[PDB]
Amino acid sequence: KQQLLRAATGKAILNGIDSINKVLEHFRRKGINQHVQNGYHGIVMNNFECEPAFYTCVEVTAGNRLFYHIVDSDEVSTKILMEFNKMNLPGEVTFLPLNKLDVRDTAYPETNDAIPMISKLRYNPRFDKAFKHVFGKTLICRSMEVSTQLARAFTMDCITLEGDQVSHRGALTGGYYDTRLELQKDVRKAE
């Protein structure tokens, strides 16, 4: 059951969880560093919900920011790495530190051919600056070409429901998309 997801994840990204987890239990078995375990909140992908029409654009918008780890602060963020690196473990780990986060206040264009991607995710409000960091700047646009207009005129990343992307600085991303949030759903369903 659970292994269906991991297969979609690649040893690269998995080794960073397996490792970030061995460090967590290590502090635990030794009974040191409590603030750390009391301030680790899971990865981006296990802390929000969205409707299945947006699986593709939400998933590609975020790529692997999908595994950034919500943590309380910069000090819980660093101690996990110090030991991660000391134990010479298979990287990598990225932290969204709630105490430190700094996200730019943006107002979206009153446009009727685009919607704020974040207005379509359900998540705990304790975890706001984090989701605003990952999603707080990308619109979901009506067509490949609407993306272009909006991403050029305004400072917003754009993306269609089918995954075609254009950055606010000009970068173009596109290719053939097959068929992670999907199986994250199925597995949330057992438990």
Binding site: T78, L81, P97, L172, Y176
Partner: protein
């Protein structure tokens, strides 16, 4: 595998596909390989083209071939900021783009884009002190590949960054190829 599509776009539109960033630049000293490899990240495979148009056609061509998604930085529309050269005075680190060598000189944009005013410091405590300590924060990376962004994000995995930085080495060996 998929780079057999990569040449395919270099062929089709002959003079207009520069290639991916690994091919157009290199970190000066072996020292900075790990810091540069952390700052560039995904943008090391980011295909630099001449126009937004060739960008677009390359994505269309890719979809037809049913191939994995690629990123194109179009030198014609790429919207980058000028390097804040006042940061060359910071008394601990030096700008990251000052430690990369590229060519041709006009792809300079693709670099101001991947790098911006990123900084590279010696140890972790230094990268932190001058990323978070100032009135304005600065993206800062240490030589072991631990990154402190202006957004508050923090990241690492010194052992993976090490294996990843070896692509620069295999890339030199192809200078003799």
């Amino acid at each position: 595998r998929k780079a057999e599509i990569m040449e395919s776009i270099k062929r089709l539109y002959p003079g207009s596909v520069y290639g991916r960033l690994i091919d157009l630049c290199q970190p000066t000293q072996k020292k900075y390989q790990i810091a540069v490899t952390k700052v560039l990240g995904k943008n090391m495979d980011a295909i630099i083209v001449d126009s937004e148009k060739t960008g677009r056609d390359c994505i269309q061509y890719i979809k037809e071939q049913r191939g994995e998604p690629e990123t194109f930085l179009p030198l014609d529309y790429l919207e980058v900021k000028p390097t804040d050269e006042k940061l060359r005075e910071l008394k601990g680190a030096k700008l990251v783009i000052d430690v990369i060598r590229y060519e041709p000189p006009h792809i300079k944009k693709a670099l101001q884009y991947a790098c911006g005013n990123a900084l590279v410091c010696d140890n972790v405590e230094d990268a932190r002190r001058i990323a978070f300590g100032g009135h304005q924060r600065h993206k800062t990376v240490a030589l072991d590949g631990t990154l402190f962004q202006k957004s508050g994000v923090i990241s690492g995995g010194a052992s993976d960054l090490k294996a990843k930085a070896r692509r620069w080495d295999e890339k030199a060996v192809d200078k003799l190829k």
